[PDB]
Coordinates of all heavy atoms in Angstrom, one line a residue:
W1 N -2.3 -21.3 3.2 CA -3.6 -21.4 3.6 C -4.4 -22.2 2.7 O -4.0 -22.5 1.5 CB -4.2 -19.9 3.6 CG -3.8 -19.1 4.7 CD1 -4.1 -19.2 6.0 CD2 -2.9 -18.0 4.7 NE1 -3.5 -18.2 6.8 CE2 -2.8 -17.4 6.0 CE3 -2.2 -17.3 3.7 CZ2 -1.9 -16.3 6.3 CZ3 -1.4 -16.2 4.0 CH2 -1.3 -15.8 5.3
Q2 N -5.6 -22.7 3.1 CA -6.5 -23.4 2.2 C -6.8 -22.6 1.0 O -7.0 -21.4 1.1 CB -7.8 -23.8 2.9 CG -7.6 -24.9 4.0 CD -6.5 -24.7 4.9 OE1 -6.4 -23.6 5.5 NE2 -5.6 -25.7 5.1
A3 N -6.8 -23.3 -0.2 CA -7.1 -22.6 -1.4 C -8.2 -21.6 -1.3 O -9.3 -21.9 -0.7 CB -7.5 -23.6 -2.5
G4 N -8.0 -20.3 -1.7 CA -9.0 -19.3 -1.7 C -9.5 -18.9 -0.3 O -10.6 -18.4 -0.2
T5 N -8.7 -19.1 0.7 CA -9.1 -18.7 2.1 C -8.0 -17.7 2.7 O -8.0 -17.6 3.9 CB -9.3 -19.9 3.0 OG1 -8.0 -20.5 3.3 CG2 -10.2 -20.9 2.3
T6 N -7.2 -17.2 1.8 CA -6.2 -16.3 2.3 C -6.8 -15.1 2.9 O -7.6 -14.4 2.3 CB -5.2 -15.8 1.1 OG1 -4.8 -17.0 0.4 CG2 -4.0 -15.1 1.6
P7 N -6.4 -14.7 4.1 CA -7.0 -13.6 4.9 C -6.5 -12.2 4.5 O -6.0 -11.5 5.3 CB -6.6 -14.0 6.4 CG -5.3 -14.7 6.2 CD -5.4 -15.5 4.9
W8 N -6.6 -12.0 3.2 CA -6.0 -10.7 2.7 C -6.4 -9.5 3.6 O -5.5 -8.6 3.8 CB -6.6 -10.4 1.3 CG -6.1 -11.4 0.3 CD1 -6.8 -12.2 -0.5 CD2 -4.7 -11.6 -0.1 NE1 -6.0 -13.0 -1.3 CE2 -4.7 -12.6 -1.1 CE3 -3.5 -11.1 0.4 CZ2 -3.5 -13.1 -1.6 CZ3 -2.3 -11.6 -0.2 CH2 -2.3 -12.5 -1.2
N9 N -7.6 -9.5 4.1 CA -8.1 -8.3 4.8 C -7.3 -8.0 6.1 O -7.2 -6.8 6.5 CB -9.6 -8.5 5.2 CG -9.8 -9.8 6.0 OD1 -9.8 -9.7 7.3 ND2 -9.9 -10.9 5.4
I10 N -6.6 -9.0 6.7 CA -5.9 -8.8 7.9 C -4.6 -8.1 7.7 O -3.9 -7.7 8.7 CB -5.7 -10.1 8.7 CG1 -4.7 -11.0 8.0 CG2 -7.1 -10.8 8.9 CD1 -4.4 -12.3 8.8
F11 N -4.1 -8.1 6.4 CA -2.9 -7.5 6.1 C -3.1 -6.0 5.6 O -4.0 -5.8 4.8 CB -2.2 -8.2 5.0 CG -1.6 -9.6 5.5 CD1 -2.2 -10.8 5.2 CD2 -0.4 -9.6 6.3 CE1 -1.7 -11.9 5.6 CE2 0.1 -10.8 6.8 CZ -0.6 -12.0 6.4
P12 N -2.3 -5.1 6.1 CA -2.4 -3.6 5.8 C -1.9 -3.2 4.4 O -1.1 -3.9 3.8 CB -1.5 -3.0 6.9 CG -0.5 -4.0 7.1 CD -1.1 -5.4 6.9
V13 N -2.4 -2.1 3.9 CA -1.8 -1.5 2.7 C -0.7 -0.6 3.1 O -0.7 0.1 4.2 CB -2.9 -0.7 1.9 CG1 -4.1 -1.6 1.5 CG2 -3.3 0.5 2.7
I14 N 0.3 -0.5 2.3 CA 1.5 0.3 2.5 C 1.5 1.4 1.5 O 1.4 1.2 0.3 CB 2.8 -0.5 2.3 CG1 2.8 -1.7 3.3 CG2 4.0 0.4 2.6 CD1 4.0 -2.6 3.1
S15 N 1.6 2.7 2.0 CA 1.6 3.8 1.1 C 3.0 4.5 1.2 O 3.5 4.8 2.2 CB 0.6 4.9 1.5 OG -0.7 4.3 1.3
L16 N 3.6 4.7 0.0 CA 4.9 5.4 -0.1 C 4.5 6.7 -0.8 O 4.0 6.8 -1.9 CB 5.9 4.6 -1.0 CG 6.2 3.2 -0.5 CD1 7.2 2.6 -1.5 CD2 6.8 3.2 0.9
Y17 N 4.9 7.8 -0.1 CA 4.8 9.2 -0.7 C 6.0 9.6 -1.4 O 7.1 9.6 -0.8 CB 4.4 10.2 0.4 CG 3.0 10.0 0.9 CD1 2.7 9.0 1.7 CD2 2.0 11.0 0.7 CE1 1.4 8.8 2.2 CE2 0.8 10.9 1.3 CZ 0.5 9.7 2.0 OH -0.8 9.6 2.6
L18 N 6.0 9.9 -2.7 CA 7.1 10.3 -3.5 C 7.1 11.8 -3.7 O 6.0 12.4 -3.8 CB 7.2 9.6 -4.8 CG 7.2 8.1 -4.8 CD1 7.2 7.5 -6.2 CD2 8.5 7.6 -4.1
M19 N 8.3 12.4 -3.8 CA 8.4 13.8 -4.1 C 7.9 14.2 -5.5 O 8.1 13.4 -6.4 CB 9.9 14.2 -4.0 CG 10.2 15.7 -4.2 SD 11.9 16.1 -4.6 CE 12.6 16.0 -3.0
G20 N 7.2 15.3 -5.5 CA 6.6 15.7 -6.8 C 7.4 16.5 -7.8 O 8.6 16.6 -7.7
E21 N 6.6 17.1 -8.8 CA 7.3 17.9 -9.8 C 7.2 19.4 -9.4 O 7.9 20.2 -9.9 CB 6.5 17.8 -11.1 CG 6.8 16.5 -11.8 CD 6.3 16.5 -13.3 OE1 5.1 16.4 -13.5 OE2 7.2 16.7 -14.2
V22 N 6.4 19.7 -8.4 CA 6.2 21.1 -8.0 C 6.5 21.2 -6.5 O 6.5 20.3 -5.7 CB 4.7 21.4 -8.2 CG1 4.5 22.9 -7.9 CG2 4.3 21.1 -9.6
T23 N 6.8 22.5 -6.1 CA 7.2 22.8 -4.8 C 6.2 22.3 -3.7 O 5.0 22.5 -3.9 CB 7.4 24.4 -4.6 OG1 8.6 24.8 -5.2 CG2 7.4 24.7 -3.1
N24 N 6.7 21.6 -2.7 CA 5.9 21.3 -1.6 C 4.7 20.3 -1.9 O 3.9 20.1 -1.1 CB 5.2 22.5 -0.9 CG 6.3 23.4 -0.3 OD1 7.3 22.9 0.2 ND2 6.0 24.7 -0.3
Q25 N 4.8 19.7 -3.1 CA 3.8 18.7 -3.5 C 4.3 17.3 -3.7 O 5.5 17.2 -4.2 CB 3.1 19.2 -4.7 CG 3.8 19.1 -6.0 CD 3.5 17.8 -6.8 OE1 2.8 17.0 -6.3 NE2 4.3 17.6 -7.9
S26 N 3.6 16.3 -3.4 CA 3.9 15.0 -3.6 C 2.7 14.2 -4.0 O 1.6 14.6 -3.9 CB 4.5 14.4 -2.2 OG 3.5 14.4 -1.2
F27 N 2.9 12.9 -4.4 CA 1.8 12.0 -4.6 C 2.2 10.7 -3.9 O 3.3 10.5 -3.5 CB 1.7 11.7 -6.1 CG 2.9 11.1 -6.7 CD1 3.0 9.7 -6.9 CD2 3.9 11.9 -7.3 CE1 4.2 9.1 -7.5 CE2 5.0 11.3 -7.9 CZ 5.2 9.9 -8.0

């Protein structure tokens, strides 16, 4: 893309939920 015109906003964020230290909890 033209310098400094990358359409960052059109790309989604990816969330990974990892298993926590406590029962039934994750972050």
Side-chain angles (χ1 to χ4, degrees):
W1 285 289
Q2 286 49 52
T5 69
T6 309
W8 292 121
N9 58 95
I10 69 174
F11 290 104
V13 301
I14 302 173
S15 292
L16 305 177
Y17 291 67
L18 300 178
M19 180 197 281
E21 287 193 282
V22 185
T23 286
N24 292 330
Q25 74 92 5
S26 65
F27 61 93

